[PDB]
């Protein structure tokens, strides 16, 4: 019966994970479209005040929320951000990718459970039960990263993006991004020469990207940088396959650790 509306995927799962069958949860941003820039339509705005609660990640993430809450009211859906209580981090422009930390993730699950139990105090034990059980999985997940990081002597991983800033900090890891580096078009002669030398003094083995690397790129990097390319994705979205496959936060996050391994445990 409880109706909750969420922004992008990770917010959706956390919520549903604690609510399960006791509530109808949906996601405004379909898992296959950039959430960062996504902008709501009048229809979406309606469904928000239409629901019992609206869950979002951070005002620095879904930058359209603050405007939405104002142009709506309180009698309608009760807004609730999961990043509430998280000291954020060095992004003015803050870094909203906190859910990419199994620890901060737990926090969000707590922050959401709160508003959930409040809104529907009857099913209190239920929501509470599920919540604890997910925080467990999340903690079981945290052990892995915390174990692999200890057994790792690399402590640093090169990337093309930088959404993994909170995952690094949580495990004394260093996320070193590169200049003009895209998974689509290969780097410029000037950039490549810059990255190339950086790999000579860091014995760089793998380079991660937001999505799969194209032929050109994946190839050039091999010969030129003499390195490979791995994914390491932000649970910002899910491929149609993963959806039908069920692969979620814990699943896709485990994938992310694997890739890391092929660099940390060298
Ligand atoms: Mn992002």
mmCIF file of C-alpha atoms and ligand atoms in Angstrom:
data_model
loop_
_atom_site.group_PDB
_atom_site.id
_atom_site.type_symbol
_atom_site.label_atom_id
_atom_site.label_comp_id
_atom_site.label_asym_id
_atom_site.label_seq_id
_atom_site.Cartn_x
_atom_site.Cartn_y
_atom_site.Cartn_z
ATOM 1 C CA UNK A 1 0.000 0.000 0.000
ATOM 2 C CA UNK A 2 2.797 2.477 0.917
ATOM 3 C CA UNK A 3 3.719 4.471 -2.183
ATOM 4 C CA UNK A 4 7.300 5.719 -2.520
ATOM 5 C CA UNK A 5 8.893 7.375 -5.554
ATOM 6 C CA UNK A 6 12.627 7.389 -6.129
ATOM 7 C CA UNK A 7 15.117 9.135 -8.390
ATOM 8 C CA UNK A 8 17.698 6.771 -9.980
ATOM 9 C CA UNK A 9 18.426 3.037 -9.492
ATOM 10 C CA UNK A 10 20.496 2.871 -6.268
ATOM 11 C CA UNK A 11 17.830 4.920 -4.488
ATOM 12 C CA UNK A 12 15.172 2.545 -5.817
ATOM 13 C CA UNK A 13 16.814 -0.638 -4.628
ATOM 14 C CA UNK A 14 17.696 0.625 -1.153
ATOM 15 C CA UNK A 15 14.105 1.696 -0.640
ATOM 16 C CA UNK A 16 12.513 -1.472 -2.076
ATOM 17 C CA UNK A 17 15.033 -3.568 -0.218
ATOM 18 C CA UNK A 18 13.561 -2.339 3.074
ATOM 19 C CA UNK A 19 9.963 -1.952 1.895
ATOM 20 C CA UNK A 20 9.642 -5.033 -0.293
ATOM 21 C CA UNK A 21 6.056 -6.221 -0.707
ATOM 22 C CA UNK A 22 4.654 -3.794 1.864
ATOM 23 C CA UNK A 23 4.885 -0.864 -0.552
ATOM 24 C CA UNK A 24 4.787 0.245 -4.184
ATOM 25 C CA UNK A 25 8.092 1.772 -5.223
ATOM 26 C CA UNK A 26 9.035 3.115 -8.617
ATOM 27 C CA UNK A 27 11.928 4.997 -10.183
ATOM 28 C CA UNK A 28 11.514 8.274 -12.028
ATOM 29 C CA UNK A 29 14.747 7.982 -13.973
ATOM 30 C CA UNK A 30 14.630 4.760 -16.030
ATOM 31 C CA UNK A 31 17.767 2.707 -15.448
ATOM 32 C CA UNK A 32 19.293 3.537 -18.838
ATOM 33 C CA UNK A 33 19.447 7.336 -18.846
ATOM 34 C CA UNK A 34 21.949 9.792 -17.318
ATOM 35 C CA UNK A 35 20.521 10.761 -13.895
ATOM 36 C CA UNK A 36 22.932 13.666 -13.360
ATOM 37 C CA UNK A 37 21.278 15.724 -16.082
ATOM 38 C CA UNK A 38 17.837 14.116 -16.049
ATOM 39 C CA UNK A 39 15.130 16.713 -15.662
ATOM 40 C CA UNK A 40 11.552 16.010 -14.450
ATOM 41 C CA UNK A 41 8.425 16.580 -16.500
ATOM 42 C CA UNK A 42 5.080 17.897 -15.242
ATOM 43 C CA UNK A 43 3.927 14.261 -15.185
ATOM 44 C CA UNK A 44 6.842 13.210 -12.982
ATOM 45 C CA UNK A 45 6.317 16.190 -10.712
ATOM 46 C CA UNK A 46 2.726 15.082 -10.293
ATOM 47 C CA UNK A 47 3.634 11.508 -9.429
ATOM 48 C CA UNK A 48 6.044 12.859 -6.808
ATOM 49 C CA UNK A 49 3.397 14.759 -4.827
ATOM 50 C CA UNK A 50 1.179 11.827 -5.686
ATOM 51 C CA UNK A 51 3.318 9.400 -3.634
ATOM 52 C CA UNK A 52 3.653 9.078 0.164
ATOM 53 C CA UNK A 53 7.386 9.798 0.107
ATOM 54 C CA UNK A 54 9.952 10.967 -2.416
ATOM 55 C CA UNK A 55 13.492 9.628 -2.006
ATOM 56 C CA UNK A 56 16.532 11.188 -3.634
ATOM 57 C CA UNK A 57 20.255 10.950 -3.154
ATOM 58 C CA UNK A 58 21.627 14.426 -2.820
ATOM 59 C CA UNK A 59 20.776 17.940 -3.833
ATOM 60 C CA UNK A 60 24.152 17.880 -5.629
ATOM 61 C CA UNK A 61 23.022 14.752 -7.451
ATOM 62 C CA UNK A 62 19.393 15.378 -8.445
ATOM 63 C CA UNK A 63 19.880 19.165 -8.609
ATOM 64 C CA UNK A 64 16.215 19.613 -9.535
ATOM 65 C CA UNK A 65 14.866 18.413 -6.189
ATOM 66 C CA UNK A 66 15.179 21.591 -4.086
ATOM 67 C CA UNK A 67 13.196 23.422 -6.776
ATOM 68 C CA UNK A 68 10.615 20.631 -6.840
ATOM 69 C CA UNK A 69 10.053 20.591 -3.085
ATOM 70 C CA UNK A 70 9.542 24.348 -2.959
ATOM 71 C CA UNK A 71 7.099 24.361 -5.902
ATOM 72 C CA UNK A 72 4.877 21.790 -4.242
ATOM 73 C CA UNK A 73 4.395 21.929 -0.490
ATOM 74 C CA UNK A 74 4.355 19.697 2.581
ATOM 75 C CA UNK A 75 0.825 18.286 2.642
ATOM 76 C CA UNK A 76 1.888 16.129 -0.313
ATOM 77 C CA UNK A 77 4.766 13.612 -0.477
ATOM 78 C CA UNK A 78 7.403 13.981 2.232
ATOM 79 C CA UNK A 79 10.840 14.499 0.708
ATOM 80 C CA UNK A 80 13.726 12.444 2.104
ATOM 81 C CA UNK A 81 17.362 12.480 1.081
ATOM 82 C CA UNK A 82 19.472 9.492 1.941
ATOM 83 C CA UNK A 83 22.717 11.460 1.998
ATOM 84 C CA UNK A 84 21.490 13.268 5.092
ATOM 85 C CA UNK A 85 24.129 12.926 7.789
ATOM 86 C CA UNK A 86 26.976 12.100 5.417
ATOM 87 C CA UNK A 87 29.762 14.640 5.787
ATOM 88 C CA UNK A 88 29.941 14.702 1.995
ATOM 89 C CA UNK A 89 33.365 15.261 0.489
ATOM 90 C CA UNK A 90 35.495 17.439 -1.797
ATOM 91 C CA UNK A 91 33.594 17.581 -5.068
ATOM 92 C CA UNK A 92 31.021 24.400 -3.513
ATOM 93 C CA UNK A 93 30.082 21.590 -5.953
ATOM 94 C CA UNK A 94 30.103 18.580 -3.622
ATOM 95 C CA UNK A 95 30.631 14.983 -4.660
ATOM 96 C CA UNK A 96 27.261 13.102 -4.473
ATOM 97 C CA UNK A 97 28.552 9.600 -5.291
ATOM 98 C CA UNK A 98 28.310 8.466 -1.669
ATOM 99 C CA UNK A 99 26.281 5.390 -2.482
ATOM 100 C CA UNK A 100 29.427 4.018 -4.145
ATOM 101 C CA UNK A 101 30.649 3.217 -0.624
ATOM 102 C CA UNK A 102 29.190 0.172 1.062
ATOM 103 C CA UNK A 103 29.463 2.033 4.375
ATOM 104 C CA UNK A 104 27.807 5.329 3.384
ATOM 105 C CA UNK A 105 25.319 3.036 1.623
ATOM 106 C CA UNK A 106 24.281 1.526 4.964
ATOM 107 C CA UNK A 107 23.782 5.027 6.306
ATOM 108 C CA UNK A 108 21.416 5.869 3.433
ATOM 109 C CA UNK A 109 19.509 2.665 4.070
ATOM 110 C CA UNK A 110 19.113 3.868 7.664
ATOM 111 C CA UNK A 111 18.059 7.399 6.637
ATOM 112 C CA UNK A 112 15.452 5.871 4.359
ATOM 113 C CA UNK A 113 14.171 3.285 6.850
ATOM 114 C CA UNK A 114 13.517 6.196 9.234
ATOM 115 C CA UNK A 115 11.075 8.033 6.994
ATOM 116 C CA UNK A 116 9.572 4.701 5.928
ATOM 117 C CA UNK A 117 8.738 3.554 9.482
ATOM 118 C CA UNK A 118 7.497 7.022 10.304
ATOM 119 C CA UNK A 119 5.120 7.241 7.357
ATOM 120 C CA UNK A 120 3.811 3.722 8.052
ATOM 121 C CA UNK A 121 4.387 3.020 11.793
ATOM 122 C CA UNK A 122 2.135 -0.062 11.704
ATOM 123 C CA UNK A 123 4.538 -2.224 9.693
ATOM 124 C CA UNK A 124 7.418 -0.857 11.807
ATOM 125 C CA UNK A 125 8.865 -4.270 12.679
ATOM 126 C CA UNK A 126 8.632 -5.433 9.058
ATOM 127 C CA UNK A 127 10.476 -2.520 7.509
ATOM 128 C CA UNK A 128 12.888 -2.695 10.423
ATOM 129 C CA UNK A 129 13.530 -6.420 9.881
ATOM 130 C CA UNK A 130 14.310 -6.139 6.168
ATOM 131 C CA UNK A 131 16.501 -3.067 6.737
ATOM 132 C CA UNK A 132 18.811 -4.864 9.144
ATOM 133 C CA UNK A 133 19.115 -7.814 6.797
ATOM 134 C CA UNK A 134 20.217 -5.613 3.878
ATOM 135 C CA UNK A 135 22.702 -3.621 6.053
ATOM 136 C CA UNK A 136 24.158 -7.091 6.763
ATOM 137 C CA UNK A 137 24.661 -7.961 3.057
ATOM 138 C CA UNK A 138 26.065 -4.484 2.624
ATOM 139 C CA UNK A 139 28.445 -5.154 5.524
ATOM 140 C CA UNK A 140 29.327 -8.602 4.161
ATOM 141 C CA UNK A 141 30.119 -6.656 0.950
ATOM 142 C CA UNK A 142 32.229 -4.186 2.929
ATOM 143 C CA UNK A 143 34.360 -7.014 4.360
ATOM 144 C CA UNK A 144 35.409 -8.052 0.856
ATOM 145 C CA UNK A 145 36.652 -4.624 -0.165
ATOM 146 C CA UNK A 146 38.201 -4.118 3.230
ATOM 147 C CA UNK A 147 39.941 -7.482 2.882
ATOM 148 C CA UNK A 148 41.131 -7.068 -0.688
ATOM 149 C CA UNK A 149 42.419 -3.591 0.116
ATOM 150 C CA UNK A 150 44.499 -5.000 2.992
ATOM 151 C CA UNK A 151 45.919 -7.775 0.819
ATOM 152 C CA UNK A 152 46.597 -5.125 -1.847
ATOM 153 C CA UNK A 153 49.922 -3.312 -2.079
ATOM 154 C CA UNK A 154 48.840 -1.055 -4.945
ATOM 155 C CA UNK A 155 46.477 1.184 -3.008
ATOM 156 C CA UNK A 156 45.756 3.168 -6.188
ATOM 157 C CA UNK A 157 43.799 2.800 -9.414
ATOM 158 C CA UNK A 158 43.839 4.905 -12.565
ATOM 159 C CA UNK A 159 40.530 5.877 -14.124
ATOM 160 C CA UNK A 160 38.926 7.993 -16.837
ATOM 161 C CA UNK A 161 36.045 9.265 -14.669
ATOM 162 C CA UNK A 162 36.000 10.036 -10.917
ATOM 163 C CA UNK A 163 32.744 8.887 -9.399
ATOM 164 C CA UNK A 164 34.589 6.491 -7.134
ATOM 165 C CA UNK A 165 35.929 9.126 -4.773
ATOM 166 C CA UNK A 166 34.125 7.734 -1.729
ATOM 167 C CA UNK A 167 34.981 4.132 -2.454
ATOM 168 C CA UNK A 168 38.681 4.951 -2.395
ATOM 169 C CA UNK A 169 38.651 6.954 0.836
ATOM 170 C CA UNK A 170 36.790 4.125 2.569
ATOM 171 C CA UNK A 171 39.672 1.779 1.817
ATOM 172 C CA UNK A 172 42.800 3.913 1.824
ATOM 173 C CA UNK A 173 42.834 3.755 -1.979
ATOM 174 C CA UNK A 174 43.878 6.389 -4.492
ATOM 175 C CA UNK A 175 41.664 7.187 -7.480
ATOM 176 C CA UNK A 176 43.920 8.815 -10.073
ATOM 177 C CA UNK A 177 41.912 10.138 -13.089
ATOM 178 C CA UNK A 178 43.489 11.037 -16.421
ATOM 179 C CA UNK A 179 43.215 13.974 -18.786
ATOM 180 C CA UNK A 180 41.426 13.690 -22.106
ATOM 181 C CA UNK A 181 40.529 10.047 -21.614
ATOM 182 C CA UNK A 182 37.235 8.749 -22.993
ATOM 183 C CA UNK A 183 35.991 5.219 -23.673
ATOM 184 C CA UNK A 184 34.744 6.446 -27.057
ATOM 185 C CA UNK A 185 37.504 8.376 -28.844
ATOM 186 C CA UNK A 186 41.170 7.704 -28.236
ATOM 187 C CA UNK A 187 43.326 10.292 -26.491
ATOM 188 C CA UNK A 188 45.211 13.049 -28.253
ATOM 189 C CA UNK A 189 48.873 12.645 -29.080
ATOM 190 C CA UNK A 190 49.625 15.191 -26.330
ATOM 191 C CA UNK A 191 47.464 13.479 -23.680
ATOM 192 C CA UNK A 192 48.490 9.922 -24.580
ATOM 193 C CA UNK A 193 52.118 10.946 -24.204
ATOM 194 C CA UNK A 194 51.218 12.380 -20.812
ATOM 195 C CA UNK A 195 49.427 9.234 -19.625
ATOM 196 C CA UNK A 196 52.087 7.039 -21.192
ATOM 197 C CA UNK A 197 54.840 8.418 -18.948
ATOM 198 C CA UNK A 198 52.611 8.245 -15.855
ATOM 199 C CA UNK A 199 52.331 4.505 -16.473
ATOM 200 C CA UNK A 200 56.086 4.148 -16.655
ATOM 201 C CA UNK A 201 56.638 5.283 -13.079
ATOM 202 C CA UNK A 202 53.522 3.653 -11.646
ATOM 203 C CA UNK A 203 53.749 0.314 -13.453
ATOM 204 C CA UNK A 204 50.082 0.940 -14.334
ATOM 205 C CA UNK A 205 48.392 -2.271 -15.391
ATOM 206 C CA UNK A 206 44.725 -1.513 -15.827
ATOM 207 C CA UNK A 207 42.664 1.586 -16.654
ATOM 208 C CA UNK A 208 38.967 1.696 -15.723
ATOM 209 C CA UNK A 209 36.063 3.464 -17.442
ATOM 210 C CA UNK A 210 32.411 4.302 -16.902
ATOM 211 C CA UNK A 211 31.302 1.935 -19.655
ATOM 212 C CA UNK A 212 33.065 -0.619 -21.874
ATOM 213 C CA UNK A 213 35.993 0.688 -23.945
ATOM 214 C CA UNK A 214 35.698 0.808 -27.708
ATOM 215 C CA UNK A 215 38.057 -1.044 -30.024
ATOM 216 C CA UNK A 216 40.251 1.953 -30.909
ATOM 217 C CA UNK A 217 40.682 3.020 -27.288
ATOM 218 C CA UNK A 218 40.973 -0.432 -25.746
ATOM 219 C CA UNK A 219 43.521 -1.210 -28.478
ATOM 220 C CA UNK A 220 45.614 1.960 -28.452
ATOM 221 C CA UNK A 221 45.957 1.805 -24.680
ATOM 222 C CA UNK A 222 47.209 -1.776 -24.939
ATOM 223 C CA UNK A 223 50.033 -1.058 -27.372
ATOM 224 C CA UNK A 224 50.834 2.523 -26.320
ATOM 225 C CA UNK A 225 50.249 2.337 -22.534
ATOM 226 C CA UNK A 226 50.748 -1.430 -22.505
ATOM 227 C CA UNK A 227 47.726 -1.716 -20.230
ATOM 228 C CA UNK A 228 44.247 -3.259 -20.273
ATOM 229 C CA UNK A 229 40.867 -1.694 -19.700
ATOM 230 C CA UNK A 230 38.248 -2.616 -17.129
ATOM 231 C CA UNK A 231 34.833 -1.183 -16.319
ATOM 232 C CA UNK A 232 34.309 -0.292 -12.636
ATOM 233 C CA UNK A 233 30.815 1.203 -12.940
ATOM 234 C CA UNK A 234 28.711 3.603 -10.995
ATOM 235 C CA UNK A 235 25.406 2.078 -10.061
ATOM 236 C CA UNK A 236 23.900 5.094 -11.814
ATOM 237 C CA UNK A 237 22.088 2.817 -14.188
ATOM 238 C CA UNK A 238 21.541 -0.782 -15.259
ATOM 239 C CA UNK A 239 21.632 -2.411 -18.711
ATOM 240 C CA UNK A 240 18.427 -4.120 -19.850
ATOM 241 C CA UNK A 241 20.300 -7.384 -19.370
ATOM 242 C CA UNK A 242 21.207 -6.743 -15.732
ATOM 243 C CA UNK A 243 17.616 -5.763 -15.052
ATOM 244 C CA UNK A 244 16.220 -8.994 -16.451
ATOM 245 C CA UNK A 245 19.148 -10.804 -14.865
ATOM 246 C CA UNK A 246 18.433 -9.150 -11.523
ATOM 247 C CA UNK A 247 22.066 -8.036 -11.042
ATOM 248 C CA UNK A 248 21.948 -5.180 -8.536
ATOM 249 C CA UNK A 249 23.934 -3.028 -6.120
ATOM 250 C CA UNK A 250 25.603 -5.928 -4.364
ATOM 251 C CA UNK A 251 26.020 -7.850 -7.662
ATOM 252 C CA UNK A 252 27.342 -5.013 -9.817
ATOM 253 C CA UNK A 253 29.477 -3.800 -6.902
ATOM 254 C CA UNK A 254 31.125 -7.202 -6.630
ATOM 255 C CA UNK A 255 31.904 -6.903 -10.311
ATOM 256 C CA UNK A 256 33.601 -3.580 -9.476
ATOM 257 C CA UNK A 257 35.769 -5.237 -6.863
ATOM 258 C CA UNK A 258 36.832 -7.929 -9.329
ATOM 259 C CA UNK A 259 38.087 -5.347 -11.827
ATOM 260 C CA UNK A 260 39.928 -3.580 -9.006
ATOM 261 C CA UNK A 261 41.641 -6.820 -8.055
ATOM 262 C CA UNK A 262 43.287 -7.063 -11.468
ATOM 263 C CA UNK A 263 45.289 -4.033 -10.393
ATOM 264 C CA UNK A 264 45.582 -4.003 -6.626
ATOM 265 C CA UNK A 265 46.742 -7.572 -6.127
ATOM 266 C CA UNK A 266 49.569 -7.362 -8.666
HETATM 267 MN MN1 LIG B 1 28.033 10.290 -11.636
#
